[PDB]
Amino acid sequence: MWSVFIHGHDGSNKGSKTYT
Amino acid sequence: TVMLDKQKELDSKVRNVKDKVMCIEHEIKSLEDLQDEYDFKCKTLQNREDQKQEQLLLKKMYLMLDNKRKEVVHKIIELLNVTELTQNALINDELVEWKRRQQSACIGGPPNACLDQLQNWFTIVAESLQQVRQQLKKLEELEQKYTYEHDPITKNKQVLWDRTFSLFQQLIQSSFVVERQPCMPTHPQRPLVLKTGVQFTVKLRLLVKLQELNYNLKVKVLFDKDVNERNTVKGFRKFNILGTHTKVMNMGSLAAEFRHLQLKEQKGPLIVTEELHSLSFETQLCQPGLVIDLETTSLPVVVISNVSQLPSGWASILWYNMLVAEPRNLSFFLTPPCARWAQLSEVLSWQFSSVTKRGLNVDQLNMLGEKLLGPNASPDGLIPWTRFCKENIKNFPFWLWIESILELIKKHLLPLWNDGCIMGFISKERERALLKDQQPGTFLLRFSESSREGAITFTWVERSPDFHAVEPYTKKELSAVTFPDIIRNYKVMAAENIPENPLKYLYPNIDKDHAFGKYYSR
């Protein structure tokens, strides 16, 4: 399992998503 | 070379037909001459005084005439036998194959060959059959002047005449074709989908190009002629054609182009987008002693009342043309069949390669194949129509998602897609395997699977490796600022609390600026 950090258009961190 | 071989073989057969009818013409001329001399000698026998030899000659001449009559008749029979074989090849093989290539072309496949080769072939066999019919009437004249018991002309005249007409009728009937399928000129890459109240165009062509036919054949357009679904299918819609229903065929090619045609509705197992209609075309050749009815139909058409329904209607055209080689399976969507991945993949690639200058590669298609068939994806896997356009494979259907991507590429990302900058269709796992072990500012462009609208996003790797992605960019964002400018001016806060552009290298290893410098507005 790995995670990707999500950033908005502005660049601000919006969270993370997890994949398998 | 396979195509060349077939072509050269047909060319040879057509030449044989032409040569054979010319030989007969020469033979018939000689036969008339022999008969005239035979007539002379029979009327002048009394004058000769030298009488016995002349009587012997007269009998020999009869024999020569009989033998020549038999020879000419035999040659005509053989010619008709060759003609039938040749025409069957032109009609049941070549033209059938051209019509199949036209189906593919309508749906984004490779371009259609021009009809002139088949026109030449159809016209030579037609001219030859016209000459034969003249040759049979000349033979009948000779028979009327002189006939005997067991005359070959008398014995074969009825069949030879019937055969020749049947062959000519079949060839001219088969030569009546839809050269360009119905299409709205405002939507040229979207054929066979017609919108009510809008202008559309269809072109007809007669492959037998005979000069006598110029300006003489009047083609009439009919909508839904002999369509049993208007009775058998509940809710079946009815339309009328506005505009001129008639056009004369003119020459070069003998053709009839219908411009300014229009459909208007008349005052539910099949949805509007799955309902299939037909345009039929009719004309008649009328000459003294010669009548032939000529008819042909377009490929099935979907009629829509709103432009919003165009992507769905297109999906139905794609399905039919990909899976069916018939012009009139109007009940196709009552029980729609499934497609193999191999056929669908080609067609999907065609969609991209028609709209843009670039199609889809094996990697992009393998990704899509998994979306439709799953990890077990094979080229022989079957995709139901319901999985392609109706069901939500997520909260949305697959073809609508693909379409909205192609409209984003057309309106906002053409040069990037054409130049190879966008990976586009890559699985999350695949993105992880390519991105990991790469340089700290490596990024890739791809389309969102979670967005119905059609969006684009970039994913970059960073050393803790950490992976990062941006919220997707739809058309609205793209209209305000171009995507190369977005890539150029993107900023994330660094650990030092200073804005920085994480986008350094386009995968595999290309400087952001080298790859996207051309497209920057500033």
Author numbering:
A (entry chain C): 11 to 30
B (entry chain A): 133 to 181, 191 to 392, 398 to 413, 422 to 547, 550 to 620, 626 to 683
From the article:
Here, we report that a highly expressed poxvirus protein, 018, inhibits IFN-induced signaling by binding to the SH2 domain of STAT1, thereby preventing the association of STAT1 with an activated IFN receptor. IFNs bind their cognate receptors to activate receptor-associated kinases that phosphorylate receptor tails, creating a docking site for STAT SH2 domains. Taken together, these data demonstrate a competitive inhibition mechanism whereby 018 binds the SH2 of STAT1 and prevents STAT1 from engaging the active IFN-signaling receptor complex. Collectively, these data show that a 21-residue fragment of 018 (aa 11–31) is sufficient for STAT1 binding and inhibitory activity.
Intrigued by this, we crystallized the STAT1 core (aa 132-684) complexed with the minimal 21-mer 018 peptide (Met11-Ser31). Crystals diffracted to 2.0 Å with 018 electron density clearly defined except for Ser31. The 018 peptide forms a β-hairpin with a β-turn midway through the sequence. The two peptide strands augment the central β-sheet of the SH2 domain, with the 018 Val14-His17 backbone hydrogen bonding to the βD strand of the SH2 domain. The 680 Å2 018-STAT1 interface is formed by multiple shallow contacts exclusively within the SH2 domain. 018 Trp12, Val14, and Ile16 form a continuous hydrophobic interface with STAT1 helix αA and strand βD. This is followed by the HxH motif, in which His17 forms an imidazole-to-imidazole hydrogen bond with His629 of STAT1. His19 occupies the same cleft as His444 of pIFNGR1, forming an identical π-stacking interaction with STAT1 Tyr634. Strikingly, 018 does not interact with the pTyr pocket. The only Tyr in the 018 peptide, Tyr29, hydrogen bonds with the ζ-amine of STAT1 Lys584 through its hydroxyl and makes van der Waals contacts with the alkyl chain of the same lysine.
